Amino acid sequence: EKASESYFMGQMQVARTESGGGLHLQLTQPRANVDLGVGFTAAYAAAAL
Amino acid sequence: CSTLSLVRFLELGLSVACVCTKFPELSYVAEGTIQFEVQQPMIARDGPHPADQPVHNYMIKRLDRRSLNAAFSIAVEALGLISGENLDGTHISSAMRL
Is B30 in contact with B65 (CB distance < 8 Å)? Predict the structure, then answer.
């Protein structure tokens, strides 16, 4: 449906770390989700095989 | 007689398949490789990626070469009359050269 669920995007973080003669920094962005619908708000079905 | 209806490559339909660009010095610089890779996309999966080597996303591509041949035989009397060596001022010779 239109407003199936609310979805909170966080802020980006880095992890500056070097390993074996190489900078290996990774990226991260925490998230969270919650369904703002009383009763079911999404359905699916098996169409083909 | 019979004409020769020439054909232009660009005016064909197949031209859309490949891009053709005139590189003049290829025959000289082809002595080695050119070796440009292109790309690869990658999905940002959750969970921390380890600190290892396999981050390869840049598969390489290497040139291959091709040629084209043609034979253009010309007779021995032809260039005789062409070069003016076997020539006399007669109307006859001034015609066979044509």
Answer: yes
C-alpha pair distances (Å), B50 with each of A30, A46, B4, B46, B84: 18, 37, 67, 12, 82
CA distance A28 to B43: 14
Q: Is B51 on the interface with A (CB under 8 A)?
A: yes
Taking a contact as any Cβ pair under 8 Å apart, which residues of chain B between 3 and 42 contact chain A? Answer: none
- Which of helix, strand or coil describes residue A25? coil
Q: What is the DSSP letter of B15?
A: G
Query: Experimental method for this entry?
Result: cryo-EM
Tell me if A11 sits within 8 A of A38, measured CB to CB.
Answer: no
**Does A17 contact B at CB distance below 8 Å?**
yes
Q: What angle do CA B77, B90, B87 make, to 5 degrees?
A: 35
